[PDB]
């Protein structure tokens, strides 16, 4: 449609800035190493830093573009490091189970 | 510690200030060739958003439609202001024309006798 083609350049548009910056939040990321505890905190306090020098519209795209990649890195660092804490759980308890049926008999 | 976070700030302002300025021509040749106004505006937004997220959704297409809907909600802001300023320039402009002429009019005795001689 004569719109269509305004839905097909946002389309362009947004896969070229959907992964554009991925390999340069990657290092900022990796260069704080942060937590569900402290992810908050860092996000706030750069925010405030960043807008205290300026404030656009890119500088906000930019910046819910960092706290996205945060969030993912916080999240899945938890995924992953809860299954190791379950399976890590169940064959602690197991090997603790296998020896107190023994000393038992 | 704050090391890195100055470090970052100043990273996205660099970032931030990239978004603004690479994608910055590729909207305003989507402005020019909608031209919305004032009633039909929202309605394109409205439209567009449901034809672009028809065939996706991402983190991408997301800032990309905040990003023409505020490039889009500006274009029509700028336009109608300075309509606006025109049409009260073009009134002042009126009256104080319409209120010179009713004075030479009067300086001459009436309109009976300015017109009629």
């Given at each position: 449609?004569?719109?269509?083609?305004?839905?097909?350049?946002?389309?362009?548009?947004?896969?070229?800035i959907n992964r554009r910056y991925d390999s340069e939040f990657?290092?900022?990321?990796?260069?704080?190493?942060?937590?569900?505890?402290?992810?908050?905190?860092?996000?706030?306090?750069?925010?405030?830093?960043?807008?205290?020098?300026?404030?656009?519209?890119?500088?906000?795209?930019?910046?819910?573009?960092?706290?996205?990649?945060?969030?993912?890195?916080?999240?899945?660092?938890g995924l992953t490091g809860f299954l190791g804490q379950v399976?890590?759980?169940?064959?602690?308890?197991?090997?603790?189970?296998?020896?107190?049926?023994?000393?038992?008999?």
């Open positions: 449609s004569t719109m269509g083609q305004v839905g097909r350049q946002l389309a362009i548009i947004g896969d070229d990657q290092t900022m990321l990796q260069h704080l190493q942060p937590t569900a505890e402290n992810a908050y905190e860092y996000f706030t306090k750069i925010a405030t830093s960043l807008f205290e020098s300026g404030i656009n519209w890119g500088r906000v795209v930019a910046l819910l573009g960092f706290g996205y990649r945060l969030a993912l890195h916080v999240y899945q660092h399976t890590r759980f169940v064959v602690d308890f197991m090997l603790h189970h296998s020896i107190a049926r023994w000393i038992a008999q």
